[PDB]
Structure formats: structure tokens, C-alpha cells
Design a binder for this molecule. Structure first.
Ligand SMILES: O=C(O)[C@@](O)(COP(=O)(O)O)[C@H](O)[C@H](O)COP(=O)(O)O
Ligand SMILES: O=C(O)[C@@](O)(COP(=O)(O)O)[C@H](O)[C@H](O)COP(=O)(O)O
Ligand SMILES: [Mg+2]
Ligand SMILES: [Mg+2]
Ligand SMILES: [Mg+2]
Lengths: 457, 455, 160
């Protein structure tokens, strides 16, 4: 059934749709399946299944319904491009407080349309949210400013937060776990749970939380510097998330503002992210995106990109989200992903298709992680252009041959080299822990700094 | 870094790993990227990133850690197959009640491994859950028996539940919405909210819930039969889900056991599904999977299949889940998808790689939806083999030329045609609502029953 | 929450968004729910913001829920007539924490899609810091308007 007369209006102007402030715009890369409709017919059916229709005519449709139809307003078949305008009245709102929910945005814009039999594939690359809808989202309540303040750094451009992940990913019992924490904190600022760490039978949650709190207090006494920890509170049950967070804050006591809460937002979902955002708005919300690669990978032609995921996370209220290493680490990523960081940190930024004004909505920190080490950091920073962020290196710190403290120190020094605009091999002659990163990761050192041996002897 | 000596043990026997009951097994279709490691080296790194390791050696590793490593135990490079055994001690448990969480299963088995730079893709096709881990999952608390009981049907093989979706998907104001409910209920049993319907500015939640409750009373008084409604209570906020569910049950009052709660479990996530399962265990939990196609489609070589999604939903406690039309409707699906229905309904079933014993865990209903109508139903049932399920037809009911009530009766009658073993064109000679479904959807009628107009 | 959040609702720049034209519903006490809402509507034809006079709440002659409902209707009518966003600051002050929550929750649910147009007024000097914190921690996304009735007993320069 051809529904292009109803659901396509290519005479609409994108600047009038933006100026009007009454529509959410989505840009997709799509291909029709062979043996069904042409590009516009398929795009029109896609808009129908994403707003008010189905695959057949229904006699219950009225003109009021027709007025809230999502409309295909721009197509470029040669570049497989489809842009759809969604009237903002379509999106669900909370009865309790009148606020927006990302679950409704996802259901309409990238829901059932992902299982259509007449579409080969369709992936969202960008979305525009007008002021009337943007202001109904929670947005972040805590930001990096709150971490910088605890660290005694300037609250504006406070700089680089030296982090790690406790490795092994799983297997350390509570006291060896806390010992690794203490060692790293002698040279670093921040530690996060590896994403699956919680209440395993061999590392019970309350025992681990208590040992980590003792290690924080001992490292702070030894160094005279503030230390931070990001705890995984992810659960299927809302009441388990609350129970984990409440126990942590009570246990950390006078160090309770040194705590961040990590949520595996992609696998547990937006509901888990919102539980932490709304129950603990004064605790930094660390969004971990484990599983995202199933749709965000450029190998996937479905779902949505990492840019779209990151932009939604800011609306959801993540204080920080993992944005990847932009090709400099072990996970899939590209140098051009620097634009993701700018979209989540600035008040105004450009996406691949839409400019977005954030209207003072708080920024979301780019959290850099995934196969990073001291040797890979200067190139990463050259591509991004700043270091006002959190970087966590698990293998990069706990794989340093002289220990966790040395590994932490090696990462601090890497950023100090990039900040002084120094040549890393020359810099290494005077910074041991950084020079000992060359020996810990000699495959990275031969690739990045050929003949580092002859100069670092 | 080659980690195969640690994370691969191909001398382990699958039958012994199952018999031991100490491991979760996952079967993946995985291809390495060129220029990295070979198949076993890549699978070993995959197991490390899915359990205890990273991409480099860390000096904090001890022998206790090595004992909980996930292990590659079987590979078939020619068929891109990799099977991994996960010690059950790896999976997170609740501090409050010691129970399992699907979020931990997902984080380890199909989490960070989906962003690996040395893998081209990796998708999970099956998983095995041993008794010691299976019994820690919620499982369904309400089933189709509870709907059959409300309808006055036998609680064993109570039969087909005739359903619809209120269409337009969005746009009906509260009274026009309730009028469509009333009309359908004159001939049908069950109505679900279309997945995004909730509290839109033009159809406020409380006004819609109140108008639907009045329509249920009127249809029940008119027909003398019980009617069911499945309300969307999906929200990012747990407290909004509770507020929606509590309002519905209070409003429906003596008809509160006629209510099911719909959750968009794929987009809102497992946390939203668990909110409904644990807050409202005596209300049928309808899992709607909008968005799943981004990973489940066979066009995707990442994430997990619809079979894996459906099996997890039973553990999470869905009373019912959409399993698709198995190629007979408008969404992507294959006739072989009938094995998904059998995995979620039986006490023992075969997946593509693993046999599963459910140990008396309640069944999850296969909810059939997506471009279905009276004409397409006989072929659907012939492939599946039974009709002890819920089928919803939105376009198929509200696209019927004689109205929602006639639309509902065409669906009822097409299942009576299949249950009776009748030729659908011969059967339509004596059943007008069914016959008029041929006129309503003539393109489907010309494909499925070639000379229906002459007959 | 800050003035940024009010400027954003008004469609003003979030930096130096300017002057918010306000009033207090007078008589301080005595208007019944509909004449109360009629005064709101009239002011909103030319102004932005209205606050409850500090003691207005749930008086026997202006029950809280009836007043809240009439004001919500007046806000919609004024917004439809002018095409401009309007704000209201409701007194939720109580001795009982649970009464403050009950007042705030009812207001937000009633105002629905206009819930971000609401501020909560607390008589923080007479009810105390405990009442201020109840509103700040229970409703952090709603502008918290601190009314200081009684402060003059100590703050006056006449007091040493
Ligand atoms: O488990 C891991 O692999 C990590 O802890 C990194 O450890 P390493 O430093 O040892 O590599 C992170 O979860 C990934 O970075 C997630 O990827 P992303 O940031 O892209 O979401
Ligand atoms: O919005 C829709 O399209 C439906 O209400 C069906 O309506 P129609 O009967 O009019 O087609 C369902 O959500 C899909 O069936 C979901 O697909 P699935 O069951 O595969 O998850
Ligand atoms: Mg990790
Ligand atoms: Mg639907
Ligand atoms: Mg006053």
C-alpha cells in the first residue's frame, strides 16, 4: 500500500520545521528491500509505523490523527538518506511530573520500524530536539565540576582526571580488590568498578564497599589528596539499585561526595539510568554503555550510532558517558568521533545533520576508556584538542611493570607531556614511570615511537 | 597478545559442562577482523573481555581469578561457531534477595565484546542456563491460564484469545479511543494499547483509562462476556510505572483482574520489565519488543537473535512476549521461528544449540502480532501446530470493511476454520465476517486463495 | 534550579534573560477559588509570574485542590490567549513533611504539561530549614522560592 501522499511532504523546509519548534527531526540511512516499494513509498510506510499508522488503511483514522502524522520531509536516494519530522505531541510524558521520557522517543523513532519486512536496513545518524521538548528532559544534575571541586581543582577547566578500572574484570576478593585501589590511588585520582563487578559470591558487595572505603581513607591520609570511586549499582530491580547506593553513601560517610554511581545503561536500559539520576541527583552518574556495539558499530546498518546514543544520554542525565577512544584504543572508533565529545560538552554543537542548542542544559563528560595507556594518550589528546575529561586505563595501569601506583603516575605524566607540547621520548628521559610504560607495552612503543630504545637506553 | 592458552580449553566436553551444572554456555556466530588474531586467539580474547580479563596481562591476576575465567570450549571456524562456558559465580546477584539479574548476564555475555576492534561481528544464537542459576530468576508469576480463567475458559488448553491493537497508533482522543475498544469487544476478547500510547497531550492517560474502563463495562453488559485490556505503563521513571499501574487497577475495580500491563522491554530495558513483574505479579505482564529488530534481524550479524531475546524474557518474568508471525505477517520472521514458541511454553525444549530444562518455571505466552488478519491465520496455525495463544490484529480488525466488531469476528472464525480443519474458501461461504475479510484485504485474498471471488 | 530554568520556560535567553514581571494575589487571604483564578488570568494577560501570598494554602474558604485546579485552568487560558508562557509559585509550606509532599505532588500532576511552569514557595524562616530542605530534596527540578516572613524579628537594624 502506497502511503506517500499522506506521510511524505517533501515541500516542507527544514529551517521552517526547526524555526517552528514543534517537531523532532530524525535523519536515517535506509535501504528498501528488493520486491517491495520504491524509496519514497518505503520511507512513507516507515513514517506511518513510527507515528500514527500501520501497513493498511483503518476506518478509525480522523483528521485530528492525520495532523500528528510523522512526515518524510527530505530524501536523497543516491546517499540512502531519509529525514522524518515527528510532531512533539506524539511523545509520551509522565503523569506524575509532566516530563519527557527517552523510552517514548526510542519507541517511535527507532522501535517497530527496525523489524519492517519491506526495509533492508535503517539506522538513525542524528536527531534534533526543539526547545519545547528539550526542556522536559532531566539533563545532568551533577557534572565534572563536582569532581574537580572535590579534587581541589578549578571548577571551570579543572583539567584531566587520572583514572583506572580494577582489573581482573572479575575474580579479586574484597581485600585484594581494595589493595589494588589503594596502590593506584597513591598516584591517581579516580577508580571505577569494572562494569560487571557487584555482588559476586566471591566478592560480596558490602564487604567490597567497606574494604574500598578503608583503602580510600588510607590513600587520602598517605597522599593528602582527595580520591574518587565510581561504583556499579546496576540491577534489574530498582530497589536493589537504591539499596546499593544508600549503603555506599552511608559507608563512605564524610567521603560520600567522592562517590560516583555507575549504571550499565545500554543493557539495563533507560529505566536503570533514570533510577540513579532521580534517586541520587547529587552523585555523579557514570553511564557505562557495554553492549552498544551491537547497534552502534559502523559494521551495523541498523539501530543508531554512538553519536545518537551519547546525545540521548545527556538528555537522560548522565554526568558522564563513555564516548570511546576515537580509534586510539582497543575498541571500534574513529578520529571523527571527537564531534561526539563536543555535542555532549558544549551549549551549541553540530551533529552530522543537525545543529543543536542545549539552552544551558548541563554538559556530560566524555569518559575515555578501552585499551588506553600512557603511550597512546598524546595522540588521543592531539585529535580531541583538550583533556577536561576522565580517562580510565585498566590494563594500562595494572599492566605497568612497576605496579598500579607507577601506572597511575605514567598516565598523569602522559597528559603532562601532551600539555607541555613535549616529544614523548625526550620527555620520558626525565619521567621514569612514563619511560617504564615503554617497557610495559613494548609493541605499542615500537609502533608509536620507533627507535625509543636507542634514545631511552 | 595471544591469550588462548588461558581462555581456550577445547578438551572440555559440552555434555560434562552441562552435567556439572556450574556453567552458563553461550553459542555465537563470530568472525575476526583481518590483521589481528586467528579464530581461536580472537575467541580467547572474546572470552577474556566477557569474564576476567582485558587486552593485556595485568599483575593483579591470581589463581583464584583464573578459576572463574570464561572458557572457549568448542569452535567450528568453517561455520564461524564459538561456544563459551561462563562459571556461574561470575554473574551478579541482588544484595536484597540473592536473586539473579539479566543485566549481569547481558553485560558479560553480550556487552563490551560487541565493541571489540579485532572482531568483525559476533552474535549469540543460544544459551544454556543450569539449574543452580535458572532457579534464581523470577520467571513468570501470571500466565495465559489467568486470562483463560477470567474469560471462563478451561485453564488447560483454554484456546485462542482473539485480540487487537487500537489503531490509529496515536491520534485518537479518549472517547474515540474508548469507542473503538467497545466496538471490537462486541466480537473479540483482548485489546492492547499500541506500544507508544500513554499520556500524550491530546489523550491524557487518566481520561483514556477512565473511558476504556467505561467501554469495558458497557461491552461486558451488552455481550455477557468478559473482556481484557493490556495497558502500556512503560516509563523511564520507576515511580511513573507504579503510578500508572496503581491508577489502572483502582479505576477498573471489580474488573482489575481483566488487566494486563504492557512494557516496552527492549527500549525501556530489563529494569522496566522487572518493575512491572515485581510490583504487579498478579497482573499479566505483556512484553512488547519494539526496537529489537536493530539486533535480532538476520540482516544483523551482531547482538543476539529473537530466540535469545524470547528465552531471556521468560527468565525475566514476562507472562507473554511478542514472538512474531513466523513469516506470515508484515515483520521479518521465518517459519522456523515456531521453535521460539516451543522454548517459551514447554518444560523442556531444544534451542539451535542447547537443550533446556525449565524445572517447572511458568510458561510465557507467544503473542502473535504484525500484519495479521483473518486470511493469514490458517497458514500461521498450520505452521505452529496450536492456537493456545494471544493474537492481536490492528489493521486486520480496524481495516475490516464492516467495522471493529466484524473485524473481531473474522479473526474468531478463522481460528474456528483452522481448529475445524476446513477449507478457508468453503468455510467463508457460511461465515460472513470471515468472507468480508477477503473483500477487506483483496491483495492478500488473491495471493492466498486464488479464485475466491468465483467461489 | 535557578532563574535560567524560568527564562527557558519563558522563551528568554538563558544568559541575561532579563526581567520577570510578577505579582502576588491580593487580598492576602479572602478570595474564593474562582475569583482567585480570575485575578491570576487577568494579571497573566500582561505579566509573567504570580506567587501565592505567603499564608495562602488550604483555608476553609479556598480549599487547596480547588484553588490549584482553578489556577491551572487560568494558566492554560492565559497561555492560549497570549501565546506566552506563564509561571506560578505555590505555597507548599507545612509543619508536616508529608503535607508538603502531598501539596507539591498534586500541583505537578494537575499542571501536567505545564508542570515546569511551577515554582514552590516555602516560608523558610517560620517553618525553618527543615521545610526548605524538604522542598529542595523532594522537588529539585522545581524552582524553590524562599519566602522569609518573620525574619525582621532578628534582621531589622533595630535588633542588636
Ligand atoms: O572492560 C573494559 O574493557 C573497560 O573497563 C576498559 O578496560 P581496559 O583499560 O583494560 O582496556 C571498559 O569497560 C571499556 O573501555 C568499555 O568500552 P567503551 O569505553 O568503548 O564503552
Ligand atoms: O504497531 C504494530 O505494528 C503492532 O501493533 C501490530 O499492528 P498491526 O496488526 O496493524 O500490524 C505491533 O506492535 C507489531 O506487531 C510489533 O511487531 P512484533 O510482534 O514482531 O514485535
Ligand atoms: Mg570494563
Ligand atoms: Mg504496535
Ligand atoms: Mg506576601
Amino acid at each position: 500500500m502506497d502511503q506517500s501522499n499522506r506521510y511524505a511532504n517533501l515541500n516542507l523546509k527544514e529551517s521552517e520545521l526547526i524555526a517552528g519548534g514543534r517537531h523532532v527531526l530524525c535523519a536515517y540511512i535506509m535501504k528498501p528491500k528488493a520486491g517491495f516499494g520504491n524509496f519514497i513509498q518505503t520511507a512513507a510506510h516507515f513514517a506511518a509505523e513510527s507515528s500514527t499508522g500501520t501497513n493498511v488503511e483503518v476506518f478509525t483514522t480522523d483528521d485530528f490523527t492525520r495532523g500528528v502524522d510523522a512526515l518524510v520531509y527530505e530524501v536523497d536516494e543516491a546517499n540512502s538518506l531519509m529525514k522524518i519530522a515527528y510532531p512533539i505531541e506524539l511523545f509520551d510524558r509522565n503523569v506524575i511530573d509532566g516530563r519527557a521520557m527517552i523510552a517514548s522517543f526510542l519507541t517511535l523513532t527507532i522501535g517497530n520500524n527496525q523489524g519492517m519486512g519491506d526495509v533492508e536496513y535503517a539506522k538513525m545518524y542524528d536527531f534534533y530536539v526543539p526547545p519545547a521538548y528539550l526542556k522536559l528532559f532531566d539533563g545532568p544534575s551533577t557534572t565534572i565540576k563536582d569532581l574537580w571541586r572535590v579534587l581541589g581543582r578549578p571548577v571551570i577547566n579543572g583539567g584531566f582526571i587520572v583514572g583506572t578500572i580494577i582489573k581482573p574484570k572479575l575474580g579479586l576478593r574484597p581485600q585484594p580488590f581494595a589493595n589494588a585501589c589503594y596502590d593506584f590511588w597513591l598516584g591517581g585520582d579516580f577508580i571505577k568498578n569494572d562494569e560487571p563487578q557487584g555482588n559476586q559470591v566471591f566478592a560480596p558487595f558490602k564487604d567490597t564497599v567497606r574494604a574500598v572505603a578503608d583503602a580510600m581513607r588510607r590513600a587520602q591520609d598517605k597522599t593528602g589528596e582527595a580520591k574518587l570511586f565510581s561504583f556499579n549499582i546496576t540491577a534489574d530491580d530498582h530497589y536493589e539499585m537504591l539499596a546499593r547506593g544508600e549503603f555506599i553513601l552511608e559507608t563512605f560517610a564524610d567521603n560520600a561526595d567522592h562517590i560516583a554511581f555507575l549504571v550499565d545503561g545500554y543493557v539495563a536500559g533507560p529505566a536503570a539510568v533514570t533510577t540513579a539520576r532521580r534517586a541520587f541527583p547529587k552523585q555523579y552518574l557514570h553511564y557505562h554503555r557495554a553492549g552498544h556495539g551491537a547497534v552502534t558499530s559502523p559494521q551495523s546498518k541498523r539501530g543508531y550510532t554512538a553519536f545518537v546514543l551519547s546525545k540521548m544520554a545527556r538528555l537522560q542525565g548522565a554526568s558522564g558517558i563513555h564516548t570511546g577512544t576515537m580509534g586510539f584504543g582497543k575498541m571500534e572508533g574513529e578520529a571523527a568521533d571527537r564531534a561526539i565529545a563536543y555535542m555532549i560538552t558544549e551549549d551549541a554543537a553540530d551533529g552530522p545533520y543537525f545543529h543543536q542548542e542545549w539552552l544551558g542544559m548541563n554538559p556530560t563528560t566524555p569518559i575515555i576508556s578501552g585499551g588506553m595507556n600512557a603511550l597512546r594518550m598524546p595522540g588521543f589528546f592531539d585529535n580531541l584538542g583538550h583533556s577536561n575529561l576522565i580517562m580510565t586505563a585498566g590494563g594500562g595501569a595494572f599492566g605497568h611493570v612497576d605496579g598500579g601506583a607507577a601506572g597511575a603516575k605514567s598516565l598523569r605524566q602522559a597528559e603532562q607531556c601532551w600539555k607541555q607540547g613535549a616529544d614523548p621520548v625526550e620527555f620520558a628521559k626525565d619521567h621514569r614511570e612514563f619511560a617504564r610504560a615503554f617497557e610495559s607495552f613494548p609493541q605499542d612503543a615500537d609502533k608509536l615511537y620507533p627507535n625509543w630504545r636507542a634514545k631511552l637506553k
